[PDB]
């Protein structure tokens, strides 16, 4: 919350009622897939879950399940922090090889921000290109805009209504903190976000089928929506969706805040130039190192609060190379200046690569991803 | 019953006077409908705008709806539809009829399927009133919301401009109601704007809307009129109807959940006769002597009120009003008259409802272009 080393996610798990992703669960995931678990799991980035056990049972018993995650398109400007969940979702889809549903809440943002319907919709379609740039299989993923899809689904709105009937205003005032002063749109929005947790909201993909297990990978701050969804699921004859939580991507200023596009000073946008990335890291990445280089060589740095090192934790694939850096920074063998330099050498190509991928997705490609249709996945209807 | 003059002032609407009725006559070339001549449709909002438009040859459309609470519809439910069908013929305009299955699902102990099915059934009776299938689109919220490129978009726009406080004070909602109810008002509001029916008005957003309804639906539209400007749409005009009397009296409340509360559209010749005689509150005197001397009271006699809604011939209605008030006519003879009017009415409606085939209902509920052409150009 205010700790320089970030939030206490063990306390968070507790006051959230979720369960920790332990060694046991990570080994099971490895066993079930025969693949080495993604570094987000190995390193505690995706630290919490809800019913991942069930998802695994289903997967091992050849039962089907699908992925569902989303994005609030509040702007054309996305940052590196926004990529975490998507990066992991793309891994989950390749590893388990299941269909994916990605909700673009353009209506949410229209409701909450000073935006035009076309703006909101435009940001959804633009952000979709960035999501497509993460590598999702065009034949296994449906990226939809709430504004468009609501009007071209024989089952989506039906579920929204079912959910709306089972969630009182008091409940959402408690869960999300709404007040008598908010517009009725905001008050009923949670149902829109919950609805995609149920397979029959996507007839063109699951056609009336209502049992497919849903797995929702998302940043921990989205949990309240699905904590609510899980309570209503049984009440309306549907299965509870499973969750896989991720920690907040640290703001440049320090781990006590998540990177927020609101404050561009804390973000590294996917549209920043190599130069801008370098100067943002060098000038703004909070350092766990010592004040003078002499003191650094003598006492060493503190990785637990160093933002530059935390970023490496998310983007440096190689486990061994990261460890050297950790040890060398801690022993003072590596100066924060060199740590910084190392991070910049990881992000510049990360972001430049992403821009290259994004430039590749043409109007025709986006349109297809956003067209409801069968996802070359056969279900025992 | 209720003093509708004090209602007009409270609600801040306008009384339908003779000028307005004469104007409607001139604009339509028809004799104004008896509901109009007899004050059944007594209040309005902007009806003059609608007339200015029609006179200047601009277009306008009709919007009304039905809450499918049950498969059981009674004579009082037809009032706004009988009138609306008249307005459609007389002005010759496209009509949109909203079946709020979602509202009933939210408010009642029903399943989505039931609410929906009730909407389809009720739609049969609505079609039985004789609406032109080339000029009217009847839709289920549950279905249309899911296949319209403009309906949901308008709901969201409306939802952004109405706070919980607002609907709390208007509909009396509480922190305890479900979130579906808190936002439903926006759904009843949406069809007030033409671009909610892109298929029928070719994406026009400036088409004048006329909403004929029972005075108790006004709140939904006072709200709608309030937001219309805030989202660049013209506000809808209204024509209010009085409450239909409950058999037990113009004081008590009626319901589809009370077979003797009114005369249901499925009743037999015998049941109609039985109901009127046994349950129609009488404005007659306690004894025949008092009746002959001081006469009956038509202002509290439910049977007479009924005749006011269904007896077409003005002169005969007056002869009965006169004879009952003079005591010349006993309440038993009055009852007799009402029954001769109601039996053929329900009988005929039941006959036309049987002519409503599943494909007819489907065509009516199928979003499509109606037999009207609207142009919209922009480069
Ligand atoms: N509401 C989230 C986006 C979202 C919608 N559905 C989701 C499911 C999983 C994760 C995120 C989402 C936001 O504002 O960012
Ligand atoms: N809500 C009204 C039905 C309705 C919906 N839209 C309307 C428009 C005009 C008049 C009535 C309606 C009811 O419960 O009966």
Could you walk me through the main structural features you see in this protein, from its secondary elements to its overall organization?
Two copies of one chain form a homodimer. With 381 residues, chain A is α/β, with parallel strands linked by helices. Chain A folds into two domains: 1-259, HUPs (Rossmann fold); 260-381, Tyrosyl-Transfer RNA Synthetase (Orthogonal Bundle). The first copy, chain A, has helices spanning 9-16, 23-33, 39-42, 52-60, 80-96, 106-112, 117-132, 146-149, 156-165, 169-175, 184-194, 203-206, 223-235, 274-284, 293-299, 307-315, 319-331, 336-360, 363-369; strands at 19-20, 48-50, 65-71, 100-104, 141-145, 213-219, 242-246, 250-251, 254-258. In chain A, the strands form two sheets. Chain A has a seven-stranded mixed sheet, with helices on both faces. Chain A has a two-stranded antiparallel ribbon with strand order 8-9. In chain A, strand 3 (65-71), helix 5 (80-96) and strand 4 form a beta-alpha-beta unit. The longest helix of chain A has 25 residues, at 336-360. The interface between A and B is large, with 37 and 37 residues. Bound molecules: tryptophan (2 copies). One tryptophan binds at residues 69-72, 103, 105, 108, 193, 216, 218, 222 of chain A.
């Amino acid at each position: 919350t205010s700790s320089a080393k970030g939030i206490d996610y063990d306390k968070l798990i507790v006051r959230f009622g979720s369960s920790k992703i332990d060694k046991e669960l990570i080994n099971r995931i490895e066993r079930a897939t025969g693949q080495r678990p993604h570094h987000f799991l190995r390193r505690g980035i995706f630290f919490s879950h809800r019913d991942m056990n069930q998802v695994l049972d289903a997967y091992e018993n050849k039962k089907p399940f699908y992925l569902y995650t989303g994005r609030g398109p509040s702007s054309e400007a996305m940052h590196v922090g926004h990529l975490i969940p998507f990066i992991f979702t793309k891994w989950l889809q390749d590893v388990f090889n299941v269909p994916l549903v990605i909700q673009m809440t353009d209506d949410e943002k229209y409701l909450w921000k000073d935006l035009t319907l076309d703006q909101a919709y435009s940001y959804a379609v633009e952000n979709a290109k960035d999501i497509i740039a993460c590598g999702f299989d065009i034949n296994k993923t449906f990226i939809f805009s709430d504004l468009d899809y609501m009007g071209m689904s024989s089952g989506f709105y039906k579920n929204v209504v079912k959910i709306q009937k089972h969630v009182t205003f008091n409940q959402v005032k408690g869960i999300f903190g709404f007040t008598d002063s908010d517009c009725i749109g905001k008050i009923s929005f949670p149902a829109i976000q919950a609805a995609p947790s149920f397979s029959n909201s996507f007839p063109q993909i699951f056609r009336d089928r209502t049992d497919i297990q849903c797995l929702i990978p998302c940043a921990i701050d989205q949990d309240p929506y699905f904590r609510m969804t899980r309570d209503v699921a049984p009440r309306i004859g549907y299965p509870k969706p499973a969750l896989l939580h991720s920690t907040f991507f640290p703001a440049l200023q320090g781990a006590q805040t998540k990177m927020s596009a609101s404050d561009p000073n804390s973000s590294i946008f996917l549209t920043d130039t190599a130069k801008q990335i370098k100067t943002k890291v060098n000038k703004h990445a909070f350092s766990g190192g010592r004040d003078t280089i002499e003191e650094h060589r003598q006492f060493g740095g503190n990785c637990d609060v160093d933002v530059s090192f935390m970023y490496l934790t998310f983007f440096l694939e190689d486990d061994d190379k990261l460890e050297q850096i950790r040890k060398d920074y801690t022993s003072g063998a590596m100066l924060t200046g060199e740590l910084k330099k190392a991070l910049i050498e990881v992000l510049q190509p990360l972001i430049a690569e992403h821009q290259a991928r994004r430039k590749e997705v043409t109007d025709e490609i986006v349109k297809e991803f956003m067209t409801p249709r069968k996802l070359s996945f056969d279900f025992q209807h």
